[PDB]
Amino acid sequence: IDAFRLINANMMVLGHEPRQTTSNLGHLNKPSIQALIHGLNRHYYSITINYRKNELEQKMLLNLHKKSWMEGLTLQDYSEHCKHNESVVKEMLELAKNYNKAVEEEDKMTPEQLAIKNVGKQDPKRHLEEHVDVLMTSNIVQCLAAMLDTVVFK
Amino acid sequence: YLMEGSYNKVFLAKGNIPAESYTFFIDILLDTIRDEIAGCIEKAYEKILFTEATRILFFNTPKKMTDYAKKRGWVLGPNNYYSFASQQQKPEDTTIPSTELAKQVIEYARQLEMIV
């Protein structure tokens, strides 16, 4: 955004600076250099804006955009969830073998050097705490939702 | 000897009271064994006639066995102690995990994501 409005080029010949600042409210936003290449500030000026929000509109767009209907009251493909519970763990073994590798070449060349040098091949340590978040929220959400169906549905 | 199952060697020590009378003590030890066998008559036993478990305490054949056989079960019949060995009512309980584990799974998520 940043709407603009012209300034007279008559005052440019006079060398006179317009708009006679009486409040510390105008010079808050800094103009971009690419707009400063153009006619700002020799032919037009910026104007600070805000937005008119109101509760007549605010609530009726928040509570209506992303509402999940009955998704978490499901079981998520019950033969395949435990199948996917091995589709991660199997390569998580070998990704821990890398974690059984990368720790072993420490007390070595000053691990700031182990920051530059590890941009070619994958590391365990970040990738290994990755799947643990995946292998938890996929399990804890699915195990809990199974045990609320047993009470509510008879 | 009261710690393990041994009962006869307990009453062999009730044949062997050497020091003084000890009378009021072993009679409470009688009484706390009387309900114990009347407790442990209730195991998985078959038909017993009115001689075998009639002599497991001490008694020959008074009406004292009718005091025990009408206190608990093992019904007075034609020389029989009837076995109501059911143990059937309690299983197939998904709900007792389903109340308790739904508490525990939330407790896993408490010390998992929110900072403590």
Question: Nearest 5°: CA angle at A108, between A104 and A112?
Answer: 110
Q: Which of B93, B99, B101, B105 to probe by mutation at the A interface, max A CB count within 10 Å?
A: B105
| Number of H-type helices and E-type strands within chain B | 4, 0
Maximum alpha-carbon separation in chain A: 87
Q: Which tokens in the block code for residue A99?
A: 């974690």
Q: Kind and range of the H or E element at A62?
A: helix A55-62
B/e letters for B12-36, b = 16+ CB within 10 Å, e = fewer, are: eeeeeeeeeeeeeebeebeeebeee
Chain B's closest residue to A146, CA to CA, is B98
How distant is the Cα of A53 from the closest Cα of chain B, in angstroms? 32
Chain B's closest residue to A143, CA to CA, is B105
> Could you say which residues from 46 to 75 on chain B have a Cβ atom under 8 Å away from some Cβ of chain A?
none
Q: Which tokens in the block code for residue B55?
A: 């002599």
Q: Which of A85, A125, A77, A90 is nearest to A105 (CA)?
A: A125
> Which distant-in-sequence residues (6+ apart) come within 8 Å of B61 by Cβ?
B50, B54
First to last CA, chain A: 57
Given an 8 Å threshold on Cβ–Cβ distance, is B106 in contact with A144?
Answer: yes
Q: Which of B98, B103, B104 to probe by mutation at the A interface, max A CB count within 10 Å?
A: B98
Tokens 């020389």 found at = B79
Q: Which of B32, A96, B53 is nearest to B24 (CA)?
A: B32
Task: Give the Cα separation of B104 and B97 in Å (integer).
Answer: 10
B/e letters for A57-92, b = 16+ CB within 10 Å, e = fewer, are: eeeeeeeeeeeeeeeeeeeeeeeeeeeeeeeeeeeb
B53, B83 contact by CB (below 8 A): no
Q: Which tokens in the block code for residue B106?
A: 């939330």
Task: Report the residue numbers after which chain A has a gap, meaning the C atom sits over 2.5 angstroms from the next written residue's N, or none.
Answer: none
**Residues, chain A:** 154
Given an 8 Å threshold on Cβ–Cβ distance, is A140 in contact with B101?
Answer: no
Q: Which tokens in the block code for residue B9?
A: 């060697």
Q: Which of A48, A140, A142 is nearest to B111 (CA)?
A: A140
Cis peptide bond upstream of A41, omega within 30:
yes
Q: Kindly provide the resolution of this structure in angstroms, with one decimal.
A: 3.0
A39, A7 contact by CB (below 8 A): no
Q: Kind and range of the H or E element at A111?
A: none
The identity of residue B24, as a single letter, is F
Q: Specify the 3-state DSSP secondary structure of B26.
A: helix
Q: Which of B53, B41, B44 is nearest to B79 (CA)?
A: B53
